[PDB]
RNA sequence: GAAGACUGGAGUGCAGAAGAGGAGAGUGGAAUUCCACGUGUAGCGGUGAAAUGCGUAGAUAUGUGGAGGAACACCAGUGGCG
Ligand SMILES: [Mg+2]
């Protein structure tokens with residue numbers, strides 16, 4: 001019995017996580033690639049992202065909602081599968097906003113690999 | 116070498132110009148970490164594959180607030196100063 005939810009998709013090189021929340025920040029249900037029962041490196045596949053997004057949409061619809069807002073972060077490739085699954089589950093999306101955090105030359109990054 | 120004479124060298128005068136040149140004091144935003152509190156449940160992280168590791172004493176995620184330190188995205192350019 002909540003409308004106007006928000007979806008947070010965190011898709012990285014190793015996993016993807018979908019958070020469904022109210023318009024304020026209180027979570028309702030969540031689903032991750034490993035929560036579906038997947039193995040390790042297989043979590044990065046966009047197929048697992050599609051499955052996780054479908055599961056999150058179904059769990060959100062169990063309590064019922066109509067519209068949704070999409071926030072984007074992470075460098076993973078499971079983004080498109082997640083957003084298309086959210087579209088196909090019956091939820092309309094007002095807009096997609098990217099919230100990938102970029103610093104203004106803040107803390108130094110860890111050293112490059114194979115050195 | 117000595118005594119004179121002259122401005123091309125050199126320097127001063129007068130009028131403008133540009134610059135991350137140097138020292139001192141104060142301030143700003145983005146982000147990371149830690150702490151406290153709401154929502155929420157079983158994984159998160161990582162790799163060529165894994166595992167050590169954190170997590171039901173309740174993470175990862177998300178919202179609010181607080182503490183502190185370091186570095187200054189776009190401008191940015193075989194551009195500039197020494
Ligand atoms: Mg001259």
Ligand SMILES: [Mg+2]
Pocket residue numbers: none
């Ligand atoms: Mg938190």
